[PDB]
Amino acid sequence: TAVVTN
Amino acid sequence: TAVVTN
Amino acid sequence: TAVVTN
Amino acid sequence: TAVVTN
């Protein structure tokens, strides 16, 4: 699980 | 699972 | 599962 | 499953 906000 | 906001 | 907003 | 908004 990878969750990114950029 | 990969979840990205950019 | 890949979910992307760009 | 791939879901993309661009």
Residue numbers in the entry:
A (entry chain A), B (entry chain A), C (entry chain A), D (entry chain A): 1 to 6
Task: Kindly provide excerpts from the paper associated with this entry.
Transthyretin (TTR)3 is a 55-kDa protein that aggregates into amyloid fibrils under pathological conditions. In its native tetrameric conformation, TTR transports retinol-binding protein and thyroxine (T4) in the blood and cerebrospinal fluid. Amyloid aggregation of TTR occurs by dissociation of tetrameric TTR into monomers; these partially unfold into amyloidogenic intermediates and self-associate into soluble oligomers and amyloid aggregates. Here we identify two segments of TTR that drive protein aggregation by self-association and formation of steric zipper spines of amyloid fibrils.
Next, we performed structural analysis of the isolated strand H segment to test whether it forms a steric zipper structure. We found that 119TAVVTN124 forms a Class-2 steric zipper (Ref. 25 and Fig. 3D) in which the β-strands stack into parallel β-sheets with one sheet face packing against another sheet back. The side chain organization explains why the residue replacements E92P and V94P hinder TTR aggregation because the proline substitution would decrease the shape complementarity between sheets in the steric zipper structure. Moreover, the crystal structure of 119TAVVTN124 is a Class-2 steric zipper, face-to-back arrangement with parallel β-strands and parallel sheets (Ref. 25 and Fig. 3D). The side chain organization in this peptide also explains why the residue replacements T119W, T119Y, V121W, and V121Y impede TTR aggregation. Taken together, these experiments suggest that the 119TAVVTN124 segment is important for fibril formation. For additional evidence, we synthesized and analyzed 6-residue peptides containing the same substitutions, and they did not form aggregates or fibrils in isolation. First, peptides with Tyr/Trp substitutions did not form fibrils in isolation.
